[PDB]
């Protein structure tokens, strides 16, 4: 091609969206945004194919232009806005709050949360670095830049971001015995505790995870997301608690 693509065939769309193959020729192409294309749920898919509040794209646009939908506390009017893992979606007229978490099947689950839990989210630290004027900052998995982080925060840790202010309230270090959630691979959606991080310099690090049933599995460190201490997650978990 001579520049960026703007369409998406339904067969080429992410499988976990569960789109009917005969419905049309195209799927909603997620727009640029906080999350990657394959790892995102556009608002149209959530509002129409998961919640069924809209019967088609035109009613999704009607809902969005009324300013009824908030993503992480901010109104979004873009139909293909790429909501993703750990995103909070608020619908005030229905008194509904959702957090985007995969189920054991590997698909984003319709997980309803309370208004108290809707006030924060968790971000995996992707980068810690000094910005201009020597101000440190952290970049999280959803593209948030947060300045003046606690000096103890490192990469692969998790921070608790208050949505109203976008500031770090607490953090969890990546260490053995921490509760982790698998966000990629064939174990996508499983929950367990870190047993060992196998390190390979110049290669991909590997993490052994033990589930509550004592089954062990190995995953790349890129697919691991710390969510709390064992027996005490920082977020409400979907049905099944990431087992099997």
């Amino acid at each position: 091609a001579r520049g960026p693509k703007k369409h998406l065939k339904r067969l080429a769309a992410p499988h976990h969206w569960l789109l009917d193959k005969l419905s049309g020729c195209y799927a909603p192409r997620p727009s640029a945004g906080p999350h990657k294309l394959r790892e995102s749920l556009p608002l149209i898919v959530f509002l129409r194919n998961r919640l069924k509040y809209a019967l088609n794209g035109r009613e999704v646009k009607a809902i969005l232009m009324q300013r009824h939908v908030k993503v992480d506390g901010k109104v979004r009017t873009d139909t293909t806005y790429p909501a993703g893992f750990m995103d909070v979606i608020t619908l005030d007229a229905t008194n509904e709050n959702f957090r985007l978490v995969y189920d054991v099947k590997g698909r984003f689950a319709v997980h309803r949360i309370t208004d108290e839990e809707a006030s924060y989210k968790l971000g995996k630290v992707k980068k810690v670095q000094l910005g201009k004027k020597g101000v440190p900052y952290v970049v999280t998995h959803d593209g948030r830049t947060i300045r003046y982080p606690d000096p103890n925060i490192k990469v692969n840790d998790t921070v608790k971001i208050d949505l109203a202010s976008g500031k770090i309230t607490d953090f969890i270090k990546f260490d053995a015995g921490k509760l982790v959630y698998v966000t990629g691979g064939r174990n996508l959606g499983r929950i367990g505790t870190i047993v060992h991080k196998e390190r390979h310099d110049g290669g991909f690090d590997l993490v052994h995870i033990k589930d509550s049933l004592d089954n062990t599995f190995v995953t790349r460190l890129n697919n691991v997301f710390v969510i709390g201490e064992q027996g005490k997650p920082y977020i409400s978990l979907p049905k099944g608690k990431g087992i099997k």
């Binding site: 339904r10 067969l11 193959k21 005969l22 049309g24 020729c25």
Partner: protein, 181 residues
């Protein structure tokens, strides 16, 4: 373009169509069950071949094998539900003992004849295609419809049928009108 839609053939031509034993067997089958052509027999033979080949492959596997348990139980349950396999023969060994007549006895045409709603298999076919038969609340006009164990006792004349309590058909009321005139 839009994604492809799947399809498949439901039958296959036999290895040697011209064997005298095969022709005589087909004659007896089509006569006893009132079949239209050899393609219906081929369709049933194709299904039975798939089922028995699956059972053979599962029996080759070790007992207590997870695949054997899962797929054999599914196959046995399906065959018992459709009525071909008896409740007292819930094993793959008896799945290998099945025959085409077992499936032909489950056709709605055969059931309509056997329950006494029709005087022959051909009268049963005519009754089904003419919208006189209901399975439960549903009119079924397909003779090859496969009756389940639970569905067996719900075969009846349809509410809309002249034989099911509705008014007479065109012929009867035409004759009555001319007789009155």
């Amino acid at each position: 373009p839009r994604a492809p839609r799947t399809y498949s053939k439901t039958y296959s031509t036999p290895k040697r169509p011209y064997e005298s034993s095969r022709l005589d067997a087909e004659l007896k089958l089509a006569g006893e069950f009132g079949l239209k052509n050899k393609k219906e027999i081929y369709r049933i033979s194709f299904q039975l071949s798939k089922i028995r080949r699956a059972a053979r492959d599962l029996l080759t596997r070790d007992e207590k094998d997870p695949k054997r348990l899962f797929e054999g139980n599914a196959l046995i349950r399906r065959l018992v539900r459709v009525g071909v396999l008896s409740e007292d023969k819930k094993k793959l060994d008896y799945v290998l003992a099945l025959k085409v007549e077992d499936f032909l006895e489950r056709r709605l045409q055969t059931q309509v004849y056997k329950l006494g709603l029709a005087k022959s298999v051909h009268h049963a076919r005519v009754l089904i295609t003419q919208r006189h038969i209901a399975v439960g609340k549903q009119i079924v006009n397909i003779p090859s419809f496969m009756v389940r164990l639970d569905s067996e006792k719900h075969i009846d004349f349809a509410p809309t049928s002249p034989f099911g309590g509705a008014r007479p058909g065109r012929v009867a009321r035409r004759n009555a009108a001319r007789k009155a005139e």
